[PDB]
Amino acid sequence: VKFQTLYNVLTGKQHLKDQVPVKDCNLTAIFLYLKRVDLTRYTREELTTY
Amino acid sequence: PELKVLFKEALLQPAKLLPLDVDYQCSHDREVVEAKRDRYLTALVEAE
Amino acid sequence: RKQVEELHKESPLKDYKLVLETKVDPSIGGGYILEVCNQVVNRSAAAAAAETAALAKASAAQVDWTSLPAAPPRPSPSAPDTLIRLLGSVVDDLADADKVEQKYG
Amino acid sequence: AGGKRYDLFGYEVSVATGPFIEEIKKAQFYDDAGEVIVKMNLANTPPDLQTYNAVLERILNCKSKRSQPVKGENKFAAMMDILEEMDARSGIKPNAESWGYVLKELVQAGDFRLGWVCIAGMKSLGITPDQALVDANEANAAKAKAAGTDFPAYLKKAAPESFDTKAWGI
Amino acid sequence: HLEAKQKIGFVHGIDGTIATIAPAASKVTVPYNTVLEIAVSATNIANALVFNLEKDGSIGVILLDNISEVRSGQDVYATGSLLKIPVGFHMLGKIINPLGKEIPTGTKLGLVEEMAPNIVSRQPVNYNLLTGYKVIDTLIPVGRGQRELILGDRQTGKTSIALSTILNQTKVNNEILSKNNVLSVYVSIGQRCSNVARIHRLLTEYDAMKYCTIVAATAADPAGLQYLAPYAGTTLGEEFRNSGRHILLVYDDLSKQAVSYRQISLLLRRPPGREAYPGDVFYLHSRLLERSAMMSPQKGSGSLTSLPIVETLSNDVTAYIVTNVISITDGQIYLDAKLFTGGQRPAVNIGLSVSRVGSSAQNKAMKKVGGALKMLMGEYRKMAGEQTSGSQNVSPVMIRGARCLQLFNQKGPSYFMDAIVALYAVTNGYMDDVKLQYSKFYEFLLLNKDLPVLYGQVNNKYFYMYNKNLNYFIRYFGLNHEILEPELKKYIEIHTNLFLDNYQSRMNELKSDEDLVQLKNLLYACKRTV
Ligand SMILES: Nc1ncnc2c1ncn2[C@@H]1O[C@H](COP(=O)(O)OP(=O)(O)OP(=O)(O)O)[C@@H](O)[C@H]1O
Numbered sequence: 001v002k003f004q005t006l007y008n009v010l011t012g013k014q015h016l017k018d019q020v021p022v023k024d025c026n027l028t029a030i031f032l033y034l035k036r037v038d039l040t041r042y043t044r045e046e047l048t049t050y
Numbered sequence: 051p052e053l054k055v056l057f058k059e060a061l062l063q064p065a066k067l068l069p070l071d072v073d074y075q076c077s078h079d080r081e082v083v084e085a086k087r088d089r090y091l092t093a094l095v096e097a098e
Numbered sequence: 099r100k101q102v103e104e105l106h107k108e109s110p111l112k113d114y115k116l117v118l119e120t121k122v123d124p125s126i127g128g129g130y131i132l133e134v135c136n137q138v139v140n141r142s143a144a145a146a147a148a149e150t151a152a153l154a155k156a157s158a159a160q161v162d163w164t165s166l167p168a169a170p171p172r173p174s175p176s177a178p179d180t181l182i183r184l185l186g187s188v189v190d191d192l193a194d195a196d197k198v199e200q201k202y203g
Numbered sequence: 204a205g206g207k208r209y210d211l212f213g214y215e216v217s218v219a220t221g222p223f224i225e226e227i228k229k230a231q232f233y234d235d236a237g238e239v240i241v242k243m244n245l246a247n248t249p250p251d252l253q254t255y256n257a258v259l260e261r262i263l264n265c266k267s268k269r270s271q272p273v274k275g276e277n278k279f280a281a282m283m284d285i286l287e288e289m290d291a292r293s294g295i296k297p298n299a300e301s302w303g304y305v306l307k308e309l310v311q312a313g314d315f316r317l318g319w320v321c322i323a324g325m326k327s328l329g330i331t332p333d334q335a336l337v338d339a340n341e342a343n344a345a346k347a348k349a350a351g352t353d354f355p356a357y358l359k360k361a362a363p364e365s366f367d368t369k370a371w372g373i
Numbered sequence: 374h375l376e377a378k379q380k381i382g383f384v385h386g387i388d389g390t391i392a393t394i395a396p397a398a399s400k401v402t403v404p405y406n407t408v409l410e411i412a413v414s415a416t417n418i419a420n421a422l423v424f425n426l427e428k429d430g431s432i433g434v435i436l437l438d439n440i441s442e443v444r445s446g447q448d449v450y451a452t453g454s455l456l457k458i459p460v461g462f463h464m465l466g467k468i469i470n471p472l473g474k475e476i477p478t479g480t481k482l483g484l485v486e487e488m489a490p491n492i493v494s495r496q497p498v499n500y501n502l503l504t505g506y507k508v509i510d511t512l513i514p515v516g517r518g519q520r521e522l523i524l525g526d527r528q529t530g531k532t533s534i535a536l537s538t539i540l541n542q543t544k545v546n547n548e549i550l551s552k553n554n555v556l557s558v559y560v561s562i563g564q565r566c567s568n569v570a571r572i573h574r575l576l577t578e579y580d581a582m583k584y585c586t587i588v589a590a591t592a593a594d595p596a597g598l599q600y601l602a603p604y605a606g607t608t609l610g611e612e613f614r615n616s617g618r619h620i621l622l623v624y625d626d627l628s629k630q631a632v633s634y635r636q637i638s639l640l641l642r643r644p645p646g647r648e649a650y651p652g653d654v655f656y657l658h659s660r661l662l663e664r665s666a667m668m669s670p671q672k673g674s675g676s677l678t679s680l681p682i683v684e685t686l687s688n689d690v691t692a693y694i695v696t697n698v699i700s701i702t703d704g705q706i707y708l709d710a711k712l713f714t715g716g717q718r719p720a721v722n723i724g725l726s727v728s729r730v731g732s733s734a735q736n737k738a739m740k741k742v743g744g745a746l747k748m749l750m751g752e753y754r755k756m757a758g759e760q761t762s763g764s765q766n767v768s769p770v771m772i773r774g775a776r777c778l779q780l781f782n783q784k785g786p787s788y789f790m791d792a793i794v795a796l797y798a799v800t801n802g803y804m805d806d807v808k809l810q811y812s813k814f815y816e817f818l819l820l821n822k823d824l825p826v827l828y829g830q831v832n833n834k835y836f837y838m839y840n841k842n843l844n845y846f847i848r849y850f851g852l853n854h855e856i857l858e859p860e861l862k863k864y865i866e867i868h869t870n871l872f873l874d875n876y877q878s879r880m881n882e883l884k885s886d887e888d889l890v891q892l893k894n895l896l897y898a899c900k901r902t903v
Pocket residue numbers: 525526527528529530531532533534684718719783784785
């Protein structure tokens with residue numbers, strides 16, 4: 001059930017409250033797309049700026 | 051001259067001045083804390 | 099049987115004899131139901147499934163995995179005086195800006 | 204305790220307060236002291252000045268109102284609402300020890316203007332403040348005056364000469 | 374494992390919320406006012422209370438929940454106990470049903486119907502309750518245990534007073550110890566679910582939900598549940614009352630509870646009475662309101678305040694339920710549709726309002742200001758009507774009265790320090806040279822800003838407004854004390870002078886239409902933020 005909900009969050013079919021973004025740190029603390037999560041760990045500003 | 055020494059010390063250890071542990075508990079995501087840190091550094095450079 | 103006459107013993111009257119009747123219910127296909135001394139006990143698959151589902155379902159609803167950010171408590175700021183000495187005007191602006199930025203990002 | 208205390212109705216109340224004071228002194232979060240008083244009034248052992256002073260000592264010496272922190276907790280508002288309870292509600296009048304704990308809290312917190320208020324209240328009530336506290340109060344005042352921290356910054360900011368709901372911070 | 378269910382019979386007839394239960398077996402007994410569980414389905418269970426037991430074994434029943442699901446052939450079982458609800462600290466922060474069910478959003482069982490304390494268990498009140506509004510805290514004081522009525526027309530400001538009173542407690546409760554806190558319960562009867570959700574979101578916004586709980590009996594919800602809700606809120610409060618804690622309780626509103634009881638009675642063909650009501654509605658509200666009391670030190674010195682709400686019709690206090698509640702309550706807060714439409718908000722009519730007990734609980738610092746403003750308003754009510762546009766007058770009475778009525782125009786709860794000083798200035802004439810429309814700005818600029826600190830007039834030693842912990846010295850010593858009085862006078866004098874010189878003159882100097890609109894916007898903002 002919860003695993004299915006996690007899979008739905010990664011799929012984007014189900015979203016979090018108050019429009020919270022999906023991140024590995026965010027996901028870890030709650031509990032091709034996966035490569036995008038590991039990317040999500042790294043700071044966005046650092047990636048774009050550098 | 052004391053004040054100049056304090057600016058040099060503050061630039062050398064900007065993070066030491068802040069309470070890192072409190073802010074780190076508080077922020078769910080590290081990125082938020084990082085943005086706060088960047089703004090403080092820029093403000094000190096503008097001050098001097 | 100054991101449950102039957104034990105329930106008959108728990109009853110206020112036990113001097114009287116005990117008779118047992120058996121019936122069939124289409125709606126429920128598992129378990130039995132027993133009635134003695136105007137006391138009913140339900141031990142059926144529909145009823146049992148509903149009870150077990152209530153425990154699991156209620157736990158699942160309490161967890162509320164979907165849409166569950168975690169926010170820690172905030173202590174007093176206790177900002178150092180030396181910081182404030184260097185830039186008193188702006189540091190105030192930055193402290194107000196921080197909270198807004200935390201909510202937006 | 205040969206003296207016998209009575210309620211407004213004339214019923215007898217018990218002065219035996221020692222075990223509750225022992226519970227207060229053993230506490231490490233200063234809301235449990237209030238919980239002690241709540242369990243104490245139910246036993247018809249209405250608080251005495253010694254108990255309120257133990258509560259004040261507990262508020263001062265304790266680290267937090269509770270195990271977990273609280274938004275807006277102040278040791279001073281507790282150590283003054285309890286005195287309002289002492290004087291107004293219960294009729295008991297505080298002593299120099301009570302105000303002394305209050306002034307210790309104000310000195311630790313760095314608030315110096317309210318420390319002068321506490322000093323003047325002590326003096327108007329015939330109480331002699333401890334000079335070790337008022338000297339530290341004046342020292343904190345000198346510190347705040349030297350660095351311009353005598354007041355916050357948002358007060359000394361120049362006001363908007365033009366009237367605007369956004370400029371006035373509303 | 375061993376748990377069993379006791380069957381008392383089957384349903385025979387249903388009529389709306391009411392029902393009749395036929396016994397299954399002779400020589401079976403059901404106790405009176407006991408809840409009964411109807412076999413709705415294999416898992417779903419209803420709940421229903423007895424009101425009469427007949428010679429024939431037939432039982433009258435009031436269905437509290439799941440009336441749409443009840444049918445005739447269904448089983449009926451007996452719990453064998455009174456109607457009880459879970460109560461405690463854990464129930465706080467949770468909107469719930471009267472029975473105890475939690476209504477979701479985006480061990481200790483207390484009795485619903487319990488006798489009120491006797492005269493020896495009670496006590497005259499000594500501590501106040503701060504509604505956050507100046508009219509109430511000044512002239513219509515509210516003690517803890519003092520149940521004071523709110524009367525008003527539809528859309529007049531009745532619910533907002535109770536919500537602001539609940540919200541005002543958060544700022545204090547976080548500071549002081551938990552014993553002197555004011556927890557709160559809010560019973561909504563007959564109200565729309567959207568309004569309850571808005572109330573929940575607001576209380577969660579201001580972080581007042583941790584101290585507050587809500588009982589919901591909407592207009593769509595059945596009638597027995599609406600009749601039962603305030604008794605359940607009183608049950609949630611009685612635990613904190615008898616446990617030495619204090620608590621507040623709100624009823625929005627008892628005028629709709631009576632309609633639900635009228636449904637229940639007339640569906641049972643009970644002999645009606647005045648204005649269609651059975652005649653026992655007085656007892657219905659008295660059972661509820663007498664439970665609100667200030668308990669004796671023998672009983673913990675706790676408290677249970679009650680701010681009920683009642684809907685008049687065309688400003689008529691001579692209705693039946695209104696007088697029935699005034700005959701029970703220890704006061705009255707009369708809000709008027711005329712003043713509400715006339716911009717005065719809260720629309721309290723001081724003449725038709727009174728607090729029979731709050732003078733004992735009022736703080737001395739507030740007591741003196743309230744005596745002064747009471748004299749002032751008793752003069753103002755006469756000086757305003759005696760002229761009837763015969764010839765205007767420029768006297769300090771009418772001036773100060775108009776200034777103070779503008780101060781009473783208040784959108785949300787105010788702090789005690791913020792409440793006194795603004796009225797001290799008017800009673801003592803410091804706010805006489807300013808204009809009417811520039812009173813709110815004055816107050817805002819006095820409290821949220823500090824002109825003396827801004828312009829360097831730092832001659833005062835401690836009296837300022839940026840701290841707000843000075844309130845607890847004002848609450849103990851009083852402003853008329855030798856120490857706070859001169860510094861207060863100097864602060865207010867400097868504020869008046871700097872206002873009249875640097876702000877008011879610039880206001881009068883403005884003549885551009887866009888500037889006047891900008892200023893009116895600022896004044897409407899000051900009318901809210903204060
Ligand atoms: N002091 C005030 N200032 C500005 N607006 C107010 C004030 N008091 C109430 N209102 C407004 O009046 C409207 C209704 O207020 P409230 O909810 O208290 O009415 P009510 O008496 O509950 O109405 P009803 O009896 O129909 O439920 C709301 O829009 C509210 O914002």
